Amino acid sequence: SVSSVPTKLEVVAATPTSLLISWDAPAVTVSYYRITYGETGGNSPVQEFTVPGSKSTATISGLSPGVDYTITVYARSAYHRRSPISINYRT
Amino acid sequence: MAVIKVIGVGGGGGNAVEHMVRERIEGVEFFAVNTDAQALRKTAVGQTIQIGSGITKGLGAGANPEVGRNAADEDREALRAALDGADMVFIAAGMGGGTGTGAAPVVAEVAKDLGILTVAVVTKPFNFEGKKRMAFAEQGITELSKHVDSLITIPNDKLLKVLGRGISLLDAFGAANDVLKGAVQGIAELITRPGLMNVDFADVRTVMSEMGYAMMGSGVASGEDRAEEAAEMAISSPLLEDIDLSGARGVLVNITAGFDLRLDEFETVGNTIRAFASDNATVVIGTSLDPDMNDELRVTVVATGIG
Ligand SMILES: Nc1nc2c(ncn2[C@@H]2O[C@H](COP(=O)(O)OP(=O)(O)O)[C@@H](O)[C@H]2O)c(=O)[nH]1
């Protein structure tokens, strides 16, 4: 019912400067994921990196404590154009 | 500018159009045709068109393509009415049932007789659905061939190879929905969200008009080598597996990028296509723009006239 890919995204561990995110395994092969993050509402350009399509986790580092971040995961697949999934978190 | 209509014919085709409305394709207008009036009303599928009221009193086609074709012949006028005005029509159907296999050829022949560029995008059933359904789908595709400009078939059996381990029956069918959508989108976005190398609709016509059988595949890549890697992934797609690309009478290529597309990248994709492409071949390569894209690229390749 979620319709995005991935369908679920959660922070599975958190430190003052780092976040470990998890997502669900996809029904259709994914070439790579595109992960972006940045301070919610901030003026500074969002950061981003890619992980290979066979991963279901990623580590975001270099963050600062007590800041609310917006984290978005795009799944890039030859077999669909599904929307990304997004969550918020404060370090 | 050119007006694009997308018509889901039958239960599978309606499931495809429902997914396309929800997920959104920019700039196309959606319709569903069906014999089953109750299924027509269940969800948001754009404008609905019931066919075969006389024969099948809204109760369906009974999985028989003869009844779905008979139902289609009753109100040719209804279809001509809603198709009128378009320049291009995509007809989406799962072949191998009753409505899709029988009514899609008729919907296609009406669209043709209005001078519309008629593109069928249809699936062939999974092997586990049985030999009868597959045989039905073959005759409906052969019948569909007589009255289309281009007929892209998506054999669902080839999707099984990319499906996740232990997937549900439902998710497997939903994955075939996404491929039909990605297929209509990858072609229509050349018109609805052009980039710098905007394809003229008259060139789309040249490469798809009165062409016959077609196949498409796609790739996606990011990083320094995004152009060559996306292009090679597309030509290596499992839906183009059995097609010798040098035998296609036409190739239509859609490079989806943001604002950062470099000259040597457009050269690179085209060099890749033109190396395999025959010389009596219409070759049409344009860009489409996706703004929420950064250092990445999608390449869609439609091989037309392979029959
Ligand atoms: N994309 C997609 N294909 C389907 C779905 N359900 C069935 N199909 C395929 O479409 C073929 C035709 O079935 P269907 O369209 O439901 O029969 P019809 O209602 O008489 O047109 C089936 O044999 C399936 O392989 C669906 O929900 N989505």
Residue numbers in the entry:
A (entry chain B): 0 to 90
B (entry chain A): 10 to 316
Q: Could you share sentences copied from the article?
A:
FtsZ is a tubulin homolog GTPase protein that is widely conserved in bacteria and plays a key role in a complex called divisome, which carries out cell division. FtsZ polymerizes into protofilaments to form the Z-ring that acts as a scaffold for accessory proteins during cell division. FtsZ treadmilling, a motion in which the protofilament polymerizes in one end (plus-end) and depolymerizes in the other end (minus-end), drives cell wall synthesis that constricts the Z-ring to form a septum of the cell. In order to aid high-resolution structure determination of the FtsZ protofilament, we developed a monobody (Mb) that binds to both KpFtsZ and EcFtsZ with high affinity.
The structures of the two crystal forms (P212121 and P21) of the KpFtsZtr–Mb and EcFtsZtr–Mb complexes were determined using molecular replacement with the KpFtsZtr crystal structure (Protein Data Bank (PDB) code: 6LL528) as the reference, at resolutions of 2.20 and 2.50 (KpFtsZtr–Mb) and 1.84 and 2.60 Å (EcFtsZtr–Mb), respectively. FtsZ in the P212121 and P21 crystals of the KpFtsZtr–Mb and EcFtsZtr–Mb complexes all showed the R conformation, and the crystals contained one and three complex molecules per asymmetric unit, respectively. The P212121 crystal structures of KpFtsZtr–Mb showed straight protofilaments in the crystal. The molecular architecture of the protofilaments was very similar to that of KpFtsZ (PDB code:6LL528), although the relative orientation of the molecules is slightly different. In the KpFtsZtr–Mb complex, the Mb interacted with the central helix (H7 helix), the H6-H7 loop, and a β-sheet in the CTD. The interaction between FtsZ and the Mb was mainly mediated by Arg residues in the FG loop of the Mb. The binding region of Mb was distant from the GTP-binding site of FtsZ, which is consistent with the finding that the GTPase activity of KpFtsZ was not mostly affected by Mb binding. In contrast, the monomeric structures of Mb-bound KpFtsZtr and Mb-free KpFtsZtr (PDB code:6LL528) showed a relatively large difference (r.m.s.d. of 1.005 Å for 272 Cα atoms for the P212121 dataset and 1.085 Å for 285 Cα atoms for the P21 dataset). The differences between these structures were observed mainly in the T3 loop and KpFtsZtr–Mb interface region. The structure of the T3 loop in KpFtsZtr–Mb showed a closed conformation similar to that of FtsZ from Pseudomonas aeruginosa, whereas the T3 loop in Mb-free KpFtsZtr adopted a unique open conformation probably due to the crystal packing.
